[PDB]
Amino acid sequence: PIVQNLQGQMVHQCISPRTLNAWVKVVEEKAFSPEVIPMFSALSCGATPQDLNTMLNTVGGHQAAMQMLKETINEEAAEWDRLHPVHPGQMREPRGSDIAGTTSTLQEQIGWMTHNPPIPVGEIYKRWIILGLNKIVRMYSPTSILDIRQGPKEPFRDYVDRFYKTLRAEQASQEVKNAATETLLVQNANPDCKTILKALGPGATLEEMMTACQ
Amino acid sequence: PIVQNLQGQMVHQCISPRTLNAWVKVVEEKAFSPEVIPMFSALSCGATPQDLNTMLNTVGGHQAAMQMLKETINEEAAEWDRLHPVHAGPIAPGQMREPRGSDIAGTTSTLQEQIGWMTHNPPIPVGEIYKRWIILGLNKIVRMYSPTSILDIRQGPKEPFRDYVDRFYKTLRAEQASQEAATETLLVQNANPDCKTILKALGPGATLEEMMTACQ
Amino acid sequence: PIVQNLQGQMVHQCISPRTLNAWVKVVEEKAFSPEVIPMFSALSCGATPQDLNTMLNTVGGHQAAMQMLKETINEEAAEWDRLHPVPGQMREPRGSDIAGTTSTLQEQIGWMTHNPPIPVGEIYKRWIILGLNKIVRMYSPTSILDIRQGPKEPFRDYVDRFYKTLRAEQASQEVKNAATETLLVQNANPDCKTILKALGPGATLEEMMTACQ
Amino acid sequence: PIVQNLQGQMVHQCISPRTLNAWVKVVEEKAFSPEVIPMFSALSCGATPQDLNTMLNTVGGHQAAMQMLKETINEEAAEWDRLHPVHAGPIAPGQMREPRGSDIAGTTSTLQEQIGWMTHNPPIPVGEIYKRWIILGLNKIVRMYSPTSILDIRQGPKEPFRDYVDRFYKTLRAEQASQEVKNAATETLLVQNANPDCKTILKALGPGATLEEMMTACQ
Amino acid sequence: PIVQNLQGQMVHQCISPRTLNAWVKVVEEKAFSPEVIPMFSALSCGATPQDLNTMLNTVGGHQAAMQMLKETINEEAAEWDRLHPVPIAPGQMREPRGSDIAGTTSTLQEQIGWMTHNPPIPVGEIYKRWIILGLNKIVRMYSPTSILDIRQGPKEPFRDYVDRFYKTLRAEQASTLLVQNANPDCKTILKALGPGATLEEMMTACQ
Amino acid sequence: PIVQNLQGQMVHQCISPRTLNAWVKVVEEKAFSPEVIPMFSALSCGATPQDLNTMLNTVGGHQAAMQMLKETINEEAAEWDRLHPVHPGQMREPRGSDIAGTTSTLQEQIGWMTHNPPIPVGEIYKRWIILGLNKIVRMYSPTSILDIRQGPKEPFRDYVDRFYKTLRAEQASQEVKNAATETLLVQNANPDCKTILKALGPGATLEEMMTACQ
Amino acid sequence: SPSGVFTFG
Amino acid sequence: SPSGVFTFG
Amino acid sequence: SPSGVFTFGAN
Ligand SMILES: O=C(O)c1ccccc1-c1c2ccc(=O)cc-2oc2cc(O)ccc12
Ligand SMILES: O=C(O)c1ccccc1-c1c2ccc(=O)cc-2oc2cc(O)ccc12
Structure with missing residues (x-):
């Protein structure tokens, strides 16, 4: 994630073992009960796109859900590319796959997230992920x-x-x-x-x- | 939450996994026995409204109690809007607006607005106000879950x-x-x-x- | 509690989940065996009155003991008020202020970090330990x-x-x-x-x- | 690993007991299931080559896999030496040298040299280069050990x-x-x-x- | 304990819940097997006498051993006073007696003053030496076999x-x-x- | 161990309960399987000799192994003294028993380790310990x-x-x-x-x- | 399209 | 009045 | 003398 240091700067901090395990364990124990989504959102506070991908990728089961989630993410990335088309030591503009962290580097993500003004690619990506997770939660509801x-x-x-x-x-x-x-x-x-x-x-x-x- | 860093400045810090899990587990293990309220209050020290909502939203069961709490919150927010109305009108560039009830409850306010209110001089303590509303509702839940007269x-x-x-x-x-x-x-x-x-x-x-x- | 920062200043820090749970668990496991009191004292190092009240109030059982403790606290608060009677200036703490019931967190910090300090946390902790001593003696199973x-x-x-x-x-x-x-x-x-x-x-x-x- | 301290400086920090234990435990519980690779990648955030080697060396089982991993590592280091050759010659003592493949894998480099490269301006990310090689090897193991078509x-x-x-x-x-x-x-x-x-x-x-x-x- | 903060100054810090629990649990699980003493010594790194007394007082069982330890402590304090005999000047540091080193007649603030003085008066390390001598005697006593x-x-x-x-x-x-x-x-x-x-x-x- | 503070100083830090417990448990659970040695080495990052002795001395069982280890240590200290004979506010030179932490104080160990140039007594001692551990692991191999x-x-x-x-x-x-x-x-x-x-x-x-x- | 599960906030 | 339980210190 | 058990890295 991105955190504030004592000098008032926003800087990268490695995702913690506690966070990694907390997310793995909540998926193992609760599957896709609704309260999994607020927990995801809380455990990914300040996350880069790389961190969000780490959390999703460390899930071992539920690969039907994880593939559906990929589909949702790609749809949202395509819409981003439709609304924000892109054209030397300067900051390039992120495309949909850059926000989703597959075609962008960590350093580019940090650059966007700490820029003035910031392009909050972590929060944009998190929004897309929660959209997909919402579809999964509704689909997996056992009861009407x-x-x-x-x-x-x-x-x-x-x-x-x-x-x-x-x-x-x-x-x-x-x-x-x-x-x-x-x-x-x-x-x-x-x-x-x-x-x-x-x-x-x-x-x-x-x-x-x-x-x-x- | 909003905490003082090691050089005495008030800054936002992500809610920790330890806190999240502690609250979830106390609700799972104790339900709404009375001592859960002091625990809630201690685990949400310095919390923003966003943090308070995270804590409430991560609870999986007890959805009847959560709906009662939501109603208590909405009642207190309505009373806030009646007794502390916000003058409607233009937006002042770069200037702090005043919170309405749904801002204090974190539904219509951004994290950055909440930080701005809580660290202003003097502070507008939207976290503590919301926490008072939440504890009001939780006490109602405790009373209702009391098994015996x-x-x-x-x-x-x-x-x-x-x-x-x-x-x-x-x-x-x-x-x-x-x-x-x-x-x-x-x-x-x-x-x-x-x-x-x-x-x-x-x-x-x-x-x-x-x-x-x-x-x- | 109150801790020292890098500016050499005494500032408030939220009680931690680890402290809270440790205290709840020692009460659950040990009840009022004598060693509970040094553990209480150690877990409340630097505590404000608010923190001390948090620790006592998070206890779920043993409400006879907790009510006796509360009566001991009220007696000590009355003795304090007997011996220490009470714009932009700092008021003097009365007994219920030291016990954290009529004082705000900010007032407690003000007293504990003033020069000279009014160590309301340590005063209240003394009263709590007096009450706990009485409970431990009363609950001793054997003569x-x-x-x-x-x-x-x-x-x-x-x-x-x-x-x-x-x-x-x-x-x-x-x-x-x-x-x-x-x-x-x-x-x-x-x-x-x-x-x-x-x-x-x-x-x-x-x-x-x-x-x- | 190499981390930014509270004042913005890049400094070495010992690998933590929590990290060490998390990696040992995920290998023990999950072996070479695919999700072990993202976990590896996350637990080695900011790692030096020395830290990466610690993580690999603390694994107790799967010693056949570790021999295969070692062979992949040697192949990638050779490719590094082919595509990023270091002109040979006397090497002035006490000065930053250019890393060869065996330096990136931590076999012929010291911790202090690794810190020097990783904190250089611009940084020479020997930890990330090595991690790419390790993950390539681990992915080959994951596919090899996949039970079903x-x-x-x-x-x-x-x-x-x-x-x-x-x-x-x-x-x-x-x-x-x-x-x-x-x-x-x-x-x-x-x-x-x-x-x-x-x-x-x-x-x-x-x-x-x-x-x-x-x-x-x-x- | 007394620790150096991130800026190089020696400051008091509360004993941590992790340390407290680690000591209680090692006594519960291992009693007075010899390896309990090195653990004690490591868990009390930087301890003031007050911290050492906290660690000793949180032990619930083994009260016979705790009485033996108390006797050892008092013997060592007596020898200290025999070898280092001691109103006070206003605002000035007094010299520790044996009972000051053991934390019975000294305040936390005095202990900090001694331990952070220049040169330091290491009352925590002296007291810890007394405690470890007593603990060694207890370990020898609980040895089951010759x-x-x-x-x-x-x-x-x-x-x-x-x-x-x-x-x-x-x-x-x-x-x-x-x-x-x-x-x-x-x-x-x-x-x-x-x-x-x-x-x-x-x-x-x-x- | 010795750690870097924000002033760029190398300073002493108390060994943590987490480190202590981790080492005790790895010896309890793995005995002298080979992977115990890299774990030791990782858990003793930055250790003074005092810390290394704490780690060895907190082990309760396996006293045959711990005595063999003590003997390897004494052999290496004697070799150190043979190769480095040692003839008012001035820093003395370490002998083998100083490197092994039996005749040196913590403050002397800090002095050597943070001196310019540093005498890395913690790393020297760790090398000796690992020589001993290597012999134990080879000896305890259950099968040829x-x-x-x-x-x-x-x-x-x-x-x-x-x-x-x-x-x-x-x-x-x-x-x-x-x-x-x-x-x-x-x-x-x-x-x-x-x-x-x-x-x-x-x-x-x-x-x-x-x-x-x- | 699902409304989400954030009862609060 | 009880003497307290702080055996040490 | 034993070669050590550090399969990866400097040994
Ligand atoms: O009651 C107060 O102290 C108060 C006075 C003016 C404005 C807001 C508050 C107020 C709070 C002030 C500080 C605080 O910590 C908590 C407060 O809670 C409130 C709750 C309300 O419903 C309605 C009001 C408050
Ligand atoms: O990305 C590259 O191809 C590259 C180019 C120049 C220097 C290093 C690399 C390179 C890496 C650069 C940054 C990074 O984080 C990781 C890299 O990994 C590499 C691995 C290689 O086998 C071979 C090369 C690299």
Whole structure:
């Protein structure tokens, strides 16, 4: 990554063994559960394109997902090349494959990221990666929100946990999520809870609902 | 977070893997037992709003609690916008704008804006404001996940008094989401007959230490 | 805590995840065995009152002990307020300021780094250790009078139990020495007691332990 | 390795216990699975030739592979001496010399010479040159030790399509020691080795379909 | 401890959680096997007397040994006062007594003052020397076996016998014979080597 | 160890708990397999003699090996004194026991190591220790190269792994190692593989041989 | 097109 | 009043 | 005397 030194300069620092292992282990343990993406984003704070490629390439399994991710990256790089076409001791301009770190050197990446003004190629690349990861997370979601119904003996809290875990993985637009909350959540509670909740009437907060059915 | 470097300057530093993992693991292991709140507060020392959101977003389970927290945050942000409105209008080149609620929550503000606010003289402490909102929501979660009412904590026939007091104040802490006359009345009232006799003999104003010595 | 930077200045540093976890784990593993207090003291080196409160509040169980500790703290804070009564100027800390409940982090730093320093962190730590001493003594499982060498217990294991109990009981050094001088030999098993009597008093513990090995 | 200190100066730093242990452990756990190579590359960020040799020498097993690696290294050093020859002659003592292949591999150079080259202006990156040679050798080992041919990866009658694609591209990565292995031949083969039902759906999609579209179609 | 910072000045630094835990764990796992003492010495590099006392006080078990150590410390402090006998001038450094070196009558700030004075008064290193003397006595006491009880088994490989021998010797020493206690075959070969043979040669001969 | 500070000074730094524990564990886990020596050498980067003695003395088992090591050290110190006889605020010259850290103080070791020109007593002593460790590794090799023979069902790769691991521990000259590679490797392959390898003809490379029996 | 999984911020 | 548990120092 | 075990590098 790029970090600030005591002289106020932004300089390169080697990716750490702790970071490398933390990412490898989160992919091993969580696969593509949604919380993998925020962790990726946090572990790649300040990353160069080289660092981001290191993190992706150190993953051993899930090569279907990793190939899909490559496809997404290449699509975003092609769009970059469409919007920013390119033409001696001077800084050249990055093409799509330069931002993705396959045709650029570390020193060029540092040059772009520390230039005044900066071309934040690490952050651009990270955006593309998260786009692909989002597609993977949604595809690997095991459950549809329509199949989440509170069991006759299931505590309401456990039902809500399942409901919003599913919603998070499915990644619908906020209007459709809101529709699901206003229509499906109470609709699919079990009869007793559903009675209590409907008695609470709309506009009740999730906290009020959960207290009522505890 | 924003920390002082070795020459006394306030600079941004990436959240560390150790911190990230510590928070994830405490949520996995303790859920929303009360002591998770002080841990949250310590692990987010100097955090920007971006860091606070990273910590909340890396939690995998407990999505009901996370939705409740999101609602508490949005309520506090709305109150911020009502009581500390930002004059709408032009942008001043090179000049610090004032944060609205969604800026403090890190949704409409950039990391660079957050750093600018937190290191200004005087500082606009958007990290600490957001953290206050988050802790408000988390305390609501702790209270809701409390399994037992204090009225149901009664000393067992053979239960040592120390164990009963442990259960008593464990329960009170969870039910209030805080460790701070009715309560002492209740402690003696629900002690078992022998202990209750001894404690009532001690009279009012006896300390917990004196009560525990008396019933040992 | 407060640490020294390269400018020779005393500045605040966030408590580390390693410190937090270390303290939580020592309480989980050791409860209120005596060695928990030196560990507390070592893990809170340079701590502010805020940091000390973080360490205490992250403890999940043992809430009877934690409430007793809190009562000890409040007593010490009242004594401080009795003995030390209270624009752009630095105010004086009252007891709840030293205990970190009515003071801000910035005020605590101001006091701890002032010239001359008002060492509120060390004052509060003293109060906490007073309370912890009382808890360790109270929670001691065994009385020194009940520590007696078993017929087949090695003398070393008996002496280990003897002095662990003595450490938890926290009597004056004169009372401890009186125990060493009478109970230790008195309560050894018959054979060891014979040898230890043949050596006589004023033999060192090393000599006693070699004699019964 | 060579790192920038807090004041912007390039200085030598001892290789750390965490790095040493991480490399030993990844070799022990993963052997020569392809993802070991990016890990190697990352754990040796800023390494001198001396550090690279430490990492290689701390490996306990796989000693046949280490002999092959040593031979690749010698080949690359010879190519360096062919394409970057050093004029022979008396060499003034106490002055920076030009590195030959055996200097880059750390066999005839001292740590202090390596530091001198790597911190020169401009730097002579003997560590990165050597690492390229090492990774070339390691990639040859990865391909040699790949257990299965891509031709033998075929979807089972009840195997979910996702698991088959996982197996397919894992195998391809090992056989090429590279993920940049997607071509028309490969997608052809992925559909060809699919099971009858999935194969029918995939052939109905036609060519030019993305992997995401293929996987959605057979879900 | 007292350490040099990145700019070359001697400054106090809190003992670290890693150090604290390392010492507690080595005592828990190894007790008073001899190799515990070099570990102690390394973990207390730069220690003030206060740090040394922290390390000793965090030990939970072995309270008999801790009492023996305390007695050794007091004996050494008494000898110090016998060999270095000592109100104070305002704002001036006083001289350490034995109990100052052991950290019982001195403050952290006084310890720092002595250790960073020019020339330094190395109270931490003096105290550490006393502690290690006591620890050596404890190691010798916890040695389970006498060197006389280390005899080569009838079918014991010579290497395993030598390992046991020198393990025992190390513990018993803390505060010719190898051959004599070898079994008959090995003993014959070894004496056949004659005198002046190295351990390497002996072990090769009986391999 | 001795480290560089920000003033460009070589200064003493305490050995770390991580280094100490790493060395203890590598000896516990690997004993005197050959790879223990490069690990030692890497973990003692910048070591003073005092640090080297700390690393050796914290080892609990293996006291036969540690005594042999002590004897090699004493031999090298005696040779140092034979080759470098040593006849008020002035720096004295180190004798062998000073280099081995038994008669020198830490401050004297720092003085020698940071002097201009430096007397690198840490590196000299480490060289002696590694001479001793080399003799221990050779002595503790469990099997002779003559006894490494491919099993009827042993993959050729596993046989060659055993062959070269033994060869590494035995530490013969390169000429002697090459002689073993040229005669024994093929001679002691199992019948089928040996037939294939002999069909290759003389002068076959290791890569060729391993491919041929794959 | 998926909306992402960053519930907060 | 308890004497404390700091055996050393 | 033994040749050492440093397969790579200066020995
Ligand atoms: O309450 C305050 O101290 C305050 C006063 C003026 C502006 C903001 C705050 C304020 C905070 C100031 C400092 C701080 O550390 C935390 C604060 O939290 C706030 C939360 C609010 O909802 C609303 C306001 C605050
Ligand atoms: O990249 C090159 O081909 C090159 C050109 C001039 C000097 C060195 C190199 C070169 C390298 C330059 C920078 C770098 O980081 C790595 C290099 O690796 C090389 C490897 C070679 O076998 C042969 C050459 C190189």
